[PDB]
Design an enzyme around this catalytic site. Structure first.
Site, PDB file in Angstrom:
ATOM      1  N   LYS A 172      -6.162   1.307  -5.899  1.00  0.00           N
ATOM      2  CA  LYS A 172      -7.369   0.948  -6.621  1.00  0.00           C
ATOM      3  C   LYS A 172      -7.625   1.873  -7.821  1.00  0.00           C
ATOM      4  O   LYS A 172      -8.369   2.854  -7.728  1.00  0.00           O
ATOM      5  CB  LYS A 172      -8.551   0.947  -5.647  1.00  0.00           C
ATOM      6  CG  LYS A 172      -8.361  -0.028  -4.472  1.00  0.00           C
ATOM      7  CD  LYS A 172      -9.538  -0.011  -3.502  1.00  0.00           C
ATOM      8  CE  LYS A 172      -9.337  -0.999  -2.344  1.00  0.00           C
ATOM      9  NZ  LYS A 172      -8.227  -0.611  -1.412  1.00  0.00           N
ATOM     10  N   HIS A 205       0.884  -1.168   0.000  1.00  0.00           N
ATOM     11  CA  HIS A 205       0.000   0.000   0.000  1.00  0.00           C
ATOM     12  C   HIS A 205       0.921   1.217   0.000  1.00  0.00           C
ATOM     13  O   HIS A 205       1.002   1.946   0.989  1.00  0.00           O
ATOM     14  CB  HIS A 205      -0.875   0.029   1.261  1.00  0.00           C
ATOM     15  CG  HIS A 205      -1.744  -1.182   1.429  1.00  0.00           C
ATOM     16  ND1 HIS A 205      -1.237  -2.431   1.723  1.00  0.00           N
ATOM     17  CD2 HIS A 205      -3.089  -1.332   1.349  1.00  0.00           C
ATOM     18  CE1 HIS A 205      -2.231  -3.296   1.819  1.00  0.00           C
ATOM     19  NE2 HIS A 205      -3.364  -2.655   1.595  1.00  0.00           N
TER      20      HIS A 205
END
Lengths: 260, 252
Positions: free
Chosen positions: B91, B59
């Protein structure tokens, strides 16, 4: 709907009130979307379009030379000088600390300068509460958010149900969510909501222009509820004179609005 | 479904085949999702989990000290040492040059090191073709994409119709779209598709998700938070996920 001036005076969102006042005072509902590769070209175009627009949509992700000093500082100066707001294109699509840091940090530090941003509703209201809290922690300046209710890209899944779900999410915060990126009126008046409807994919049906004729005309979209027309390459590509095109579209957009 | 070994021998996507082989060889269908604030914590946890995972999800957007020399460099060394793939969480949710550059450029230059990425299908097929072209231009190394067909966050709009539409987008490229981040089986076997089903929110129980069709269990905080021993938890979840895999009935 009421007039832009009237909506400004009664809007719960300080960012929306400011934008509606800009539109009235400058007689423009034109938003210029400048997706260019260099800061140099960006600043030249903004300078030329400044007096014609109520909003400037940036696309920092595609700039090959973004810098807070060279890109953002001058942009804010132009924004203040010409009186228009900044809207960064980045289509946020996450929640919590992730979306908060995507909005506040990184090299772009978007929240520090973008008056308005937009987000996909698919992830749920968490994207709203998250961006809202980041904005408050980051700056004293007011901030606003638009939900990507209806997409224009080929094969998008922004169906009637997805759009409805997005509208419901918007209702969770009338102070922060000032409207939508959509292709038609999203209602909400009966319930006390006054959403800004900003619509991309707009043209003027210019003679012999096949590419431009693929889009909907300014008259068409403004007639169906659009409050702001988002125009991109049609303002500066293929050797066009940005200042001239800016006036053309401003003029067309405003006259259609008055016609409404 | 066929076994991981069998799917590795027939899958059209090189990255998917590589992943299936890692799973079969290391006897693991565990993906470690590490959302930490520093590269130091990241490398510490990866070292501890490397032996027990088939996939490591990063991340980078929340790393305060991300860098190619300090983060990516040691990270790839670890994936190579312990044999596991890298999956960046970002995303993606756009098309054209915008999505291509968010994937290939910026400070992260994700495409350069992330074997697998994931994208929201709401924007349409363009997200697939855009990311696919960027991967091709950035590297010749195998790259794959997962569609976020079913989200788990509160009030998400990933409904049945959205999922349906997402599945249809996935069908547009079985070479590049290797599967979904989903909570259940997405079918496709009758149409010649062999999709990897990676499932988050596991701690639902391992047995439950694996029994319903999940191919990989994505576990995050459950492995390293609350003073847990990532090495110990990595083994516990791996064993649980592998045993669940072993008892489901295979295609004969």
């Amino acid at each position: 709907k009421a007039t832009y001036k009237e909506r400004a005076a009664t809007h719960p969102s300080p960012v929306a009130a400011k934008l509606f006042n800009i539109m009235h005072e400058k007689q423009t509902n034109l938003c210029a979307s400048l997706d260019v590769r260099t800061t140099k070209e960006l600043l030249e175009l903004v300078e030329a379009l400044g007096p014609k627009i109520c909003l400037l949509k940036t696309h920092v992700d595609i700039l090959t030379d973004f810098s807070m000093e060279g890109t953002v500082k001058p942009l804010k100066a132009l924004s203040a000088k010409y009186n228009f707001l900044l809207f960064e294109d980045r289509k946020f699509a996450d929640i919590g600390n992730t979306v908060k840091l995507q909005y506040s940090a990184g090299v772009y530090r978007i929240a520090e300068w973008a008056d308005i941003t937009n987000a996909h509703g698919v992830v749920g209201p968490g994207i709203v509460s998250g961006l809202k809290q980041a904005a408050e922690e980051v700056t004293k300046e007011p901030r606003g958010l638009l939900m990507l209710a209806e997409l224009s890209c080929k094969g998008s899944l922004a169906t009637g149900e997805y759009t409805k779900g997005t509208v419901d999410i918007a209702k969770s915060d009338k102070d922060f969510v000032i409207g939508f990126i959509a292709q038609r009126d999203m209602g909400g008046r009966d319930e006390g909501y006054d959403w800004l409807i900003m619509t991309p994919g707009v043209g003027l049906d210019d003679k012999g222009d096949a590419l431009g004729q693929q889009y909907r005309t300014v008259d068409d979209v403004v007639s169906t509820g659009s409050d702001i027309i988002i125009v991109g390459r049609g303002l500066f590509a293929k050797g066009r004179d940005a200042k001239v095109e800016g006036e053309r579209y401003r003029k067309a957009g405003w006259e259609a609005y008055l016609r409404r």
